[PDB]
Amino acid sequence: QAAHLSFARLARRYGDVFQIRLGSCPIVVLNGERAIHQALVQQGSAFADRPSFASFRVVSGGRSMAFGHYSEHWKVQRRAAHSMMRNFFTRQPRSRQVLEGHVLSEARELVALLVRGSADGAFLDPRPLTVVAVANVMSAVCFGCRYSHDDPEFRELLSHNEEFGRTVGAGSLVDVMPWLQYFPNPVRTVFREFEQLNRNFSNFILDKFLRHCESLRPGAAPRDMMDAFILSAEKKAAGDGARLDLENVPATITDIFGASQDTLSTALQWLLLLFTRYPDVQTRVQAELDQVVGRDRLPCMGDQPNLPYVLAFLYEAMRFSSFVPVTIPHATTANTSVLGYHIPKDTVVFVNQWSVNHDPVKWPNPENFDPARFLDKDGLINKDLTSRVMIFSVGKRRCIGEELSKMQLFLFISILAHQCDFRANPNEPAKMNFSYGLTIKPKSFKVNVTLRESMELLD
Ligand code: HEM
Numbered sequence: 001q002a003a004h005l006s007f008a009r010l011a012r013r014y015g016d017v018f019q020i021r022l023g024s025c026p027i028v029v030l031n032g033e034r035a036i037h038q039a040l041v042q043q044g045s046a047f048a049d050r051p052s053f054a055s056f057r058v059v060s061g062g063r064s065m066a067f068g069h070y071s072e073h074w075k076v077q078r079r080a081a082h083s084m085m086r087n088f089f090t091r092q093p094r095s096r097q098v099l100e101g102h103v104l105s106e107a108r109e110l111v112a113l114l115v116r117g118s119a120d121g122a123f124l125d126p127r128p129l130t131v132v133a134v135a136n137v138m139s140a141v142c143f144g145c146r147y148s149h150d151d152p153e154f155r156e157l158l159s160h161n162e163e164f165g166r167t168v169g170a171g172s173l174v175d176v177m178p179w180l181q182y183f184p185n186p187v188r189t190v191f192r193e194f195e196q197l198n199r200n201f202s203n204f205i206l207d208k209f210l211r212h213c214e215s216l217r218p219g220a221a222p223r224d225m226m227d228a229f230i231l232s233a234e235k236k237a238a239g240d241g242a243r244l245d246l247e248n249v250p251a252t253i254t255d256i257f258g259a260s261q262d263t264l265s266t267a268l269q270w271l272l273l274l275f276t277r278y279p280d281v282q283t284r285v286q287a288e289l290d291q292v293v294g295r296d297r298l299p300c301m302g303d304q305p306n307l308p309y310v311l312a313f314l315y316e317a318m319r320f321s322s323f324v325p326v327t328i329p330h331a332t333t334a335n336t337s338v339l340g341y342h343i344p345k346d347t348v349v350f351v352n353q354w355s356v357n358h359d360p361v362k363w364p365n366p367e368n369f370d371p372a373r374f375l376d377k378d379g380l381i382n383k384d385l386t387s388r389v390m391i392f393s394v395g396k397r398r399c400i401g402e403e404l405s406k407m408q409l410f411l412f413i414s415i416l417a418h419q420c421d422f423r424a425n426p427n428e429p430a431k432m433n434f435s436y437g438l439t440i441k442p443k444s445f446k447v448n449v450t451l452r453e454s455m456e457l458l459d
């Protein structure tokens with residue numbers, strides 16, 4: 001009973017394009033490959049605008065990029081994030097290394113703690129470790145300051161993600177039915193909780209905005225991304241390519257932290273769930289890692305073209321999961337048409353990512369987890385097929401960390417596979433249930449982690 005599912009069904013009789021009406025507001029639901037790539041690439045900028053949904057106006061003081069309406073103050077606000085998304089990593093040799101280093105740093109902590117909780121045949125919820133973990137990499141990049149797995153106030157700040165999904169997830173009732181906010185019942189709850197955890201993110205980050213402003217005394221080289229965005233805006237204040245005004249630097253860092261922490265936490269959940277619930281893909285990835293790099297030395301980002309399965313799993317996991325099944329709802333700039341069907345200006349729009357990744361005219365074994373799906377005859381990755389899984393979206397509103405988030409999940413499992421052993425609790429029958437909202441996060445699932453051969457992570 002999650003919205004990604006029910007649109008491909010509605011599509012079958014009514015069209016790859018059709019239009020539901022949620023409460024009052026009119027949704028157009030793009031479900032093909034052909035639908036989406038027409039709409040968002042070929043008619044892009046005609047769909048690059050966001051709903052007039054006022055939960056979006058809650059996010060990051062209303063100055064969010066994720067949820068912001070498409071315009072020229074938004075142009076430079078995306079242009080400045082991405083060209084920081086692209087610039088930070090790669091400006092000079094080893095730009096990636098300091099990032100790479102955090103993943104290893106944290107990977108060593110994860111397998112330490114995963115193994116810690118799991119001794120004596122035990123099993124444990126890997127959830128609250130993989131978010132402390134994933135959020136540290138991004139807090140070391142953004143704020144130059146990781147957080148311990150002791151800190152209950154940090155773990156707090158992270159323990160409300162299922163809320164932020166639900167509220168602004170496509171399929172929802174907090175924006176499109178304003179009549180529901182006068183009385184107790186799920187839809188009243190789910191939004192009031194939502195306004196709470198946005199307060200606590202934008203209070204947690206405008207916080208780091210002050211102290212970094214307190215830090216950077218003109219004779220300086222930016223020692224953070226928080227810094228780098230302020231150096232960016234303090235250079236667009238007292239003189240004259242992509243540079244914000246300060247007033248949006250709190251908001252734009254918030255989106256880049258809040259995004260990553262939630263999604264990359266999910267992604268890294270799902271992969272463990274695919275090793276536990278498909279033992280023999282764990283085996284392959286775990287083997288091919290061994291041969292290509294060795295037991296002798298733990299694996300690094302160099303190894304990537306030389307690891308065709310660990311990509312071919314990464315990608316099938318992406319597809320099968322489709323853990324972002326419906327992108328942050330788009331809206332229209334001017335008029336348009338998709339597969340003929342004429343779609344009026346400012347109409348609300350959804351984008352079904354699960355209906356690119358599960359169309360069985362394009363994707364044969366659609367609900368089978370099959371990584372080796374992505375594999376050439378002589379055994380290679382096959383760039384042709386692999387570049388058609390829809391999960392980061394496309395055209396004007398596509399994801400800007402895609403580049404980064406791939407390099408974070410690759411390492412993270414290239415360590416975890418190569419260092420640890422993952423067991424599904426055999427006493428867990430009725431299947432791995434979920435909890436849908438923007439993202440598809442597994443419900444409490446339990447895993448036993450033994451070390452393969454000592455700890456090589458210790459520097
Ligand atoms: C596996 C990891 C990730 C996935 C699957 C993912 C997926 C997505 C999706 C589906 C969207 C919406 C696209 C649309 O509405 O057209 C999006 C937007 C966004 N993502 Fe991600 N994302 C991931 C990681 C990250 C990370 C690490 C960051 C930090 C850079 C990030 C920052 C953003 C931002 C700022 C937006 C808003 C872009 C915009 O509205 O124009 N994402 N992402």
Ligand SMILES: [N-]=[N+]=N[C@H]1CC[C@@H](c2cc(=O)c3ccc4ccccc4c3o2)CC1
Pocket residue numbers: 059060064065066160161164197198201254255256258259260262263323324328438439
């Ligand atoms: N999968 N997927 N999609 C994207 C992932 C997350 C992106 C995002 C952007 C923000 O600005 C933001 C802000 C405060 C948040 C507070 C708690 C949790 C999350 C937050 C958050 O998340 C938007 C959608």
